[PDB]
Amino acid sequence: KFMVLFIMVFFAFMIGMFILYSYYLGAKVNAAFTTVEESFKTLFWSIFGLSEVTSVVLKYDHKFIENIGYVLYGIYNVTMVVVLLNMLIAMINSSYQDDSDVEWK
Amino acid sequence: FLAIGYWIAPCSRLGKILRSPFMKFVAHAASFIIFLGLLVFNASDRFEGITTLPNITVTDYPKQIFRVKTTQFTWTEMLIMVWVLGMMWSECKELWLEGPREYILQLWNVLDFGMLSIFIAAFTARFLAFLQATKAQQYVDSYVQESDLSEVTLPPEIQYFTYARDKWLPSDPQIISEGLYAIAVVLSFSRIAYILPANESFGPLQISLGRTVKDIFKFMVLFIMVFFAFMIGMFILYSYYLGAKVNAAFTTVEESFKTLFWSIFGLSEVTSVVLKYDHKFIENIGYVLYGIYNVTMVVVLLNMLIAMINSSYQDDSDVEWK
Lengths: 105, 322
Ligand SMILES: [Ca+2]
Description:
This is part of a larger assembly, with 2 copies of chain A. In chain A, 66% of the residues lie in helices and 0% in strands.
């Protein structure tokens, strides 16, 4: 049930960052957000810290678009932690309320 | 078609069912799903990527100014602009009816006004770019007949609009438009949480999510003071070693901010503190300051995690959701 909340957050930045970087296909350090699939790949592996910060860096001097990508990618990481932190706390409280023995037997 | 039926037959079988509060929530949710569909479908030609490199210009007809083709509004674009005008009008009426004070005193009203204003700014910026392109286009059709802009040397003011994306000015309206449009699209999908309270399964989850965000807000203030302590301290240490470092980690206040922010997620490498020169005293201080920052940041995060766990330890989520 918590994934559904994070899918909405994930899809918000997948479309938003892909739209931002779709026109800079050959003008980026890598292929991070140039396509919807690459936008999915980058944001999924950012959950485990496996996506580098150069994902948002541009070869061109369009610092406005590059700095927006920094903030959107920075907000995504902060938002993802908050969603994970909320899931961790909520599931801890759910367990706080000899029942595991009954369910196993 | 349902909207048309309401106008022609306001008082009918269709009128009563459409006036039901559940059907007016569904209709508002349905319209916003269409709006998100228009946002996604607008960029549907780039799902697999752009065939043309940002270095090469493609024009539909030989005499066209390139910036005309890249700034012209399509039929999907017009629908998005109208949907925004419709959404903004509803927010303006709520601002006028409820009041300029109570309106603000709601998380959704400020967020909805924020994302609609960014949409308007994004479209205003693109409109300004479109006007400039038309002015360049007007010059070509009324003064140029030089076989597809091959040998003719246009004035520099007008020649700029035949350039590819790489030659665009860093602050031209087209770049500002798509930069703001991306922010609005991300903010748009945040409104999906506006319809989540109605569901009995995902409604309580969003209530608890908002409670944690409010809890984290007060803890950030503590971490901002820690973050700003090392941002200034490490920038001061490394500011003089601009060309004498492995990278540009702490050479400027912005680079000092970038490095320390991504260190939260482990995305800043240890070579951020390494110097090219033999000044090991400054390099080892940077190691300790960067090491202390990571340890301090964990302690602040650990304190926030524990405090928020105890805050929840004291059937109340059901009451808050209902
Ligand atoms: Ca509202």
